[PDB]
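Exercise 7. Given the components listed, write out the predicted structure of the assembled complex. Treat all entries as one system.
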Amino acid sequence: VSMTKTSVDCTMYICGDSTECSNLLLQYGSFCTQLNRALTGIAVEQDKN
Amino acid sequence: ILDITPCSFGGVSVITPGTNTSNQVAVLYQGVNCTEVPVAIT
Ligand SMILES: *[C@@H]1O[C@H](CO)[C@@H](O[C@@H]2O[C@H](CO)[C@@H](O)[C@H](O)[C@H]2NC(C)=O)[C@H](O)[C@H]1NC(C)=O
Ligand SMILES: *[C@@H]1O[C@H](CO)[C@@H](O)[C@H](O)[C@H]1NC(C)=O
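Answer.
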């Protein structure tokens, strides 16, 4: 009926606590917002199911 | 020998009635035991 609701912090995963990595990651645009939007969409749907 | 653990972190969800109803909000620190949110007393 459902599966585990994963949420990922895309910045903690890629750059974990490094701010000079995080400034480089901002240069890639919306990709972390897309990845978190997609996983939040799946996570809400596990309750709907 | 010391163990190293990354110090507490997690998702923050903000819970609101609509803006047309109120500006008051509640906040959920997801998977955080809030002995640690007072230890963080932006
Ligand atoms: C949040 O963390 C505290 C510890 O800082 C937990 O308190 C312990 O709970 C267990 C189970 O009741 C007791 O055996 C310990 O003696 C408690 N320690 C202290 C210092 O009180 C608390 O239970 C945690 N909250 C949750 C929901 O697990
Ligand atoms: C806010 O809700 C009321 C009904 O409770 C409605 O009349 C009003 O039009 C709403 N505000 C806006 C900006 O539409």
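Discussion: Helices of chain A lie at 10-15, 19-26, 31-48. Chain A has three helices and no strands.
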